[PDB]
Amino acid sequence: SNSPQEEVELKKLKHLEKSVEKIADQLEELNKELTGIQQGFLPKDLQAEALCKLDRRVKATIEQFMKILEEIDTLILPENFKDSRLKRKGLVKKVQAFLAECDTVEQNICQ
Amino acid sequence: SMSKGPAVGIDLGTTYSCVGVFQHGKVEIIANDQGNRTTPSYVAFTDTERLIGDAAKNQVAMNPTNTVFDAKRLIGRRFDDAVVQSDMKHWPFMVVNDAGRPKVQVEYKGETKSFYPEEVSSMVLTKMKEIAEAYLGKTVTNAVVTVPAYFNDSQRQATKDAGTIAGLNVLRIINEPTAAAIAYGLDKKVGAERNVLIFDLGGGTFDVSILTIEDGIFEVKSTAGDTHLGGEDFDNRMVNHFIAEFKRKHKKDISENKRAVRRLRTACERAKRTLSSSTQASIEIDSLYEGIDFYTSITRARFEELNADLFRGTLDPVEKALRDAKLDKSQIHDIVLVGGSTRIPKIQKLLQDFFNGKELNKSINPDEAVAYGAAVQAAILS
Ligand SMILES: Nc1nc2c(N)ncnc2[nH]1
Ligand SMILES: [Cl-]
């Protein structure tokens, strides 16, 4: 029952998946820097200062994932569009798992 | 270097500002670098930069403390003014007293900095000037800046000073209800003196003004309204309705989860706008709260009922304005719709019914009408 109409929605979702991959790469770089400081040569006091410097970037990452969620939330997908509904659900869950990682980072810096 | 450009009309608003230009026998409202016909009256200060407009509003969640807005509420006012004292309770930025004058206090590039409201408004005006220059491909210096009809001498002078700081040559300062009347050419209609009611519901304020136009002369007869009434109040009612709906259907309270409330509020703002052109709006939010998908809809009728008292309450200011101007509703020649919320069909119906089926002036975009009239005035003064 695959419709050309559904291809339009899948293309919008694929674009949003690529935007999510770009933000996820930023989160990955933030995780590498956090780990580097925690396992580094700086003494405990200088470590806390270096970690709180990452705060702006984590907040920008969280905000970027929130804007993606708001964009996904504008989609209306009829029940017949099973592949689009599954892709949207998987993408929201993927963003939510990334947001939970961002939360772990935010709670471990500037304490 | 760019050639010299024409004079522009600028509506320096509480929440959003708008810039227009009269070119080729018509007013063109100018889109900003993000393609938006209105620009948030927001200024943000970061560790590395100063942001104005959409760029400032877009990072408000990230930097709430250093993101200034509502400077129009504070302009030309004394620190001890009741309006200043009441309003600051609701702002996440600091407002300090400097020898009886209010200043916004922020962190900017790791340093504590304070700004007069006219300095913040000059930054918004600089952005509007730049928006005009980017579209025209010419230098913009001359402009007409609008102010509310209830603004006092201090509030008017401080707005002109914001223009001066911004490098603008302020041709004239004209009232917002006067600009809306000028946009519709109400001062060009043949005949005796005409009584004009301006219904302005937008930019987080509700302003009702009554003017008399006699021989091309505008006289402000009365002003009424509610300072903090707008689209957000209507939005809250939809949010509360949905939260209650989620509680009934899933026995789960989403109201403590800021992200769930935000996703719902954003969907509601959009749904409300849809309800101004359609009779039903659908909302599909996957995994809204605790993995639960929230698929729902709202009819225009349900939205109207949820806001019944707020919509009906807009007529009280109109009656107060008619009373103060010493006019019967039958004596109003023209009714002008200003502000984005006037797009709400029930608001138009309530006002038209109050004025016994009289047609409203609503052809110009309500959010742009003030800048439209200021742009016409700017061309007249060129
Ligand atoms: N600015 C703005 N646009 C709208 C609209 N389309 N409907 C309702 N309120 C609004 N507010
Ligand atoms: Cl344009």
Author numbering:
A (entry chain F): 150 to 260
B (entry chain E): 0 to 381
Sentences from the paper on this structure:
The 70 kDa heat shock proteins (HSP70s) are an abundant family of ATP-dependent molecular chaperones, involved in many cellular processes including protein folding, prevention of protein aggregation, modulation of protein complexes, and protein transport between cellular compartments. HSP70s bind to extended hydrophobic sequences in newly synthesised and partially folded proteins, in a manner dependent on a cycle of ATP hydrolysis and ADP/ATP exchange. The two main cytosolic HSP70s are the ubiquitously expressed HSC70 (HSPA8), and the stress-induced HSP72 (HSPA1A)3.
The difference in affinity between 3 and 2, between adenine and adenosine, and between 8-aminoadenine and 8-aminoadenosine illustrates the importance of the ribose group in nucleotide binding. In addition, we found an intriguing difference between the HSC70-NBD conformations of the adenine/adenosine, 8-aminoadenine/8-aminoadenosine and triciribine fragment/triciribine structural pairs. In this conformation, the peptide groups between Gly201 and Gly202 and between Gly202 and Gly203 are flipped relative to the nucleotide-bound conformation of phosphate-binding loop 2. By contrast, and to our surprise, in all HSC70-NBD/BAG1 structures bound to carbocycle-containing ligands and small fragments, phosphate-binding loop 2 adopts the distorted conformation also present in the nucleotide-free HSC70-NBD/BAG1.
